[PDB]
Amino acid sequence: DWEIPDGQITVGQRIGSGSFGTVYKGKWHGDVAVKMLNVTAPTPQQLQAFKNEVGVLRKTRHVNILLFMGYSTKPQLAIVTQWCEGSSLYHHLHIIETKFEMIKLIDIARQTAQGMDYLHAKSIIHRDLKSNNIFLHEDLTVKIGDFGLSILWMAPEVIRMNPYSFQSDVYAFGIVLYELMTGQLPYSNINNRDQIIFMVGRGYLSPDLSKVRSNCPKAMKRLMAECLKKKRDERPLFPQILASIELLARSLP
Amino acid sequence: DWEIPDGQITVGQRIGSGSFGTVYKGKWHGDVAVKMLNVTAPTPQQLQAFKNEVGVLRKTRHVNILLFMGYSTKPQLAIVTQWCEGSSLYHHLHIIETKFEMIKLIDIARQTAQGMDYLHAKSIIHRDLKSNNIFLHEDLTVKIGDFGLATVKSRWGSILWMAPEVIRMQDKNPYSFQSDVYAFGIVLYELMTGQLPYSNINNRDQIIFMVGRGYLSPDLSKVRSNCPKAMKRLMAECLKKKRDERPLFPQILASIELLARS
Numbered sequence: 001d002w003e004i005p006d007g008q009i010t011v012g013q014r015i016g017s018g019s020f021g022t023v024y025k026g027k028w029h030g031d032v033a034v035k036m037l038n039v040t041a042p043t044p045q046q047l048q049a050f051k052n053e054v055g056v057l058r059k060t061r062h063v064n065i066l067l068f069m070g071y072s073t074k075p076q077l078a079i080v081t082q083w084c085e086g087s088s089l090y091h092h093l094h095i096i097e098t099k100f101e102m103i104k105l106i107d108i109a110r111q112t113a114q115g116m117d118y119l120h121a122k123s124i125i126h127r128d129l130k131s132n133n134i135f136l137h138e139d140l141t142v143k144i145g146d147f148g149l150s151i152l153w154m155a156p157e158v159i160r161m162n163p164y165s166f167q168s169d170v171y172a173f174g175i176v177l178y179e180l181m182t183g184q185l186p187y188s189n190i191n192n193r194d195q196i197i198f199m200v201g202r203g204y205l206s207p208d209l210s211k212v213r214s215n216c217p218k219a220m221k222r223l224m225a226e227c228l229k230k231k232r233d234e235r236p237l238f239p240q241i242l243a244s245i246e247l248l249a250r251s252l253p
Numbered sequence: 254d255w256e257i258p259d260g261q262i263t264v265g266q267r268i269g270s271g272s273f274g275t276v277y278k279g280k281w282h283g284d285v286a287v288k289m290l291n292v293t294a295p296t297p298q299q300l301q302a303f304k305n306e307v308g309v310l311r312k313t314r315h316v317n318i319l320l321f322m323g324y325s326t327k328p329q330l331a332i333v334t335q336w337c338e339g340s341s342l343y344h345h346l347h348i349i350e351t352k353f354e355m356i357k358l359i360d361i362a363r364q365t366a367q368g369m370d371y372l373h374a375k376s377i378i379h380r381d382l383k384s385n386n387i388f389l390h391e392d393l394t395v396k397i398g399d400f401g402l403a404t405v406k407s408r409w410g411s412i413l414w415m416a417p418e419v420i421r422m423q424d425k426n427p428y429s430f431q432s433d434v435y436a437f438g439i440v441l442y443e444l445m446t447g448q449l450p451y452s453n454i455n456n457r458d459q460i461i462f463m464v465g466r467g468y469l470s471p472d473l474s475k476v477r478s479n480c481p482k483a484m485k486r487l488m489a490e491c492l493k494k495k496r497d498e499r500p501l502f503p504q505i506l507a508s509i510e511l512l513a514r515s
């Protein structure tokens with residue numbers, strides 16, 4: 001059992017609030033992260049969503065997965081993970097425009113695929129992989145999670161509309177691959193969210209692969225296309241994705 | 254359940270090998286560390302020790318505690334944990350002789366204290382806390398474990414971290430939260446002096462006899478001068494020959510988290 005004894009966790013500075021939960025930095029045997037539900041009485045749907053997240057995270061134990069540490073049901077619903085120092089991959093690529101070099105982008109790719117493989121082996125479908133959910137711990141270690149509190153990462157069959165599968169996550173990983181090698185989001189020239197949803201859903205729109213860094217190895221570019229295949233079945237599974245990056249990582253540095 | 258699906262682990266490089274198992278660098282969803290038995294069929298009392306280690310590791314989910322990932326029985330009894338790059342605190346201090354900064358020395362203690370506080374709360378006595386069992390992953394993160402043999406052996410069982418009540422080897426069980434504290438106090442000594450205690454004595458049995466009867470004690474006057482007053486005071490508290498005059502880990506952690514921001 002992973003229930004943290006009552007009255008141990010001291011909540012500190014308020015990080016991020018969302019329509020559902022709120023995150024605080026806190027103290028429990030050092031620095032910890034705390035995702036709380038700020039409600040006086042939780043509904044059955046809230047209670048159930050809590051029990052899912054906990055049920056899932058307790059099955060994870062891997063360097064590329066955000067480390068789960070415990071939960072508290074009284075006084076308020078809370079999930080406790082390690083405290084990570086750094087930013088999301090989203091932040092580095094699109095906000096503070098960190099210029100990583102090729103070797104490092106590939107290491108991020110590998111590590112993300114490393115953890116993704118882990119989740120899939122245990123029948124865990126992420127359902128919402130995106131650069132924002134990939135936290136870069138100490139600007140070294142990928143820690144995949146759900147920092148949720150959308151659309152660019154959604155595969156066609158998820159937009160047309162349970163349509164989630166191992167392959168739906170690969171497409172999201174494909175978009176993350178795109179972000180890494182371009183440094184930009186897909187469809188940056190289109191400024192109408194509703195139209196993107198329509199177009200990607202019909203196959204009219206695809207990420208423009210021509211925008212890759214000149215020094216992105218061909219093997220990376222070819223893997224990317226495989227992951228973005230509009231049809232579920234054509235997309236490689238993560239064991240093959242990893243193998244492909246691990247073959248490419250070989251003859252490069 | 255944390256049994257790893259049969260035959261997924263590939264064992265590679267060979268790191269260390271006592272009589273109680275062999276440590277390998279392996280592969281399971283990335284680079285991992287593997288400790289396993291190399292006998293045909295394990296004895297009843299070897300299977301037990303395996304079951305205890307797994308029993309303990311399964312209860313730990315902490316940044317400063319070495320990350321247990323899974324175990325396997327077929328083909329062999331094996332424990333899988335995360336792979337760590339770098340070397341123990343012992344190596345850095347007494348073999349390669351890294352000249353760490355004071356801020357970092359305090360951080361190294363702050364983390365070991367964090368880790369120990371966690372284990373003690375989960376009702377886990379370490380029983381062999383020493384700078385050999387303090388791994389410095391990527392030279393910036395303390396991972397506490399029992400690396401018996403996966404790291405270099407200490408100068409002299411290892412004796413330097415044992416409290417007086419532990420060395421006297423009384424038939425009644427002497428291991429307590431405080432004995433871990435004393436070991437921490439010796440680790441602190443190691444950090445603050447860059448040296449091992451009782452370095453001017455060359456007889457193992459003398460050291461044993463004298464620490465036990467309280468005729469020997471670490472020489473406090475050996476510490477760096479840029480070492481805080483609040484640290485020396487604490488390090489003396491942790492080494493107090495009286496068992497329960499030694500601060501428990503929550504109070505230790507608070508004291509280090511105090512001066513850390515001044």
Ligand SMILES: CC(C)(N)c1cc(NC(=O)[C@H]2CCc3ccc(Oc4ccnc5c4CCC(=O)N5)cc3C2)cc(C(F)(F)F)c1
Nearest residue numbers: 023033034035053056079081082083084126144145146147
């Ligand atoms: C519901 C389901 C099945 N889709 C699902 C939920 C999650 N949920 C999480 O990962 C949550 C857990 C609670 C929690 C708490 C604190 C938190 O915020 C941290 C953590 C560490 N460091 C920092 C911050 C804040 C911002 C900073 O600066 N540091 C983040 C999270 C993330 C994971 C998975 C996965 F394992 F499959 F990926 C799957």
Ligand SMILES: CC(C)(N)c1cc(NC(=O)[C@H]2CCc3ccc(Oc4ccnc5c4CCC(=O)N5)cc3C2)cc(C(F)(F)F)c1
Nearest residue numbers: 276286287288306309319332334335336337398399400403
């Ligand atoms: C039985 C009991 C209660 N005394 C006990 C045993 C342990 N046992 C461990 O920690 C073992 C587990 C198996 C294992 C396997 C591989 C290994 O070698 C690693 C690991 C990581 N990285 C590296 C290496 C090699 C050298 C390098 O370069 N990297 C180390 C260990 C350490 C922990 C605890 C504690 F956590 F409570 F303190 C308590």
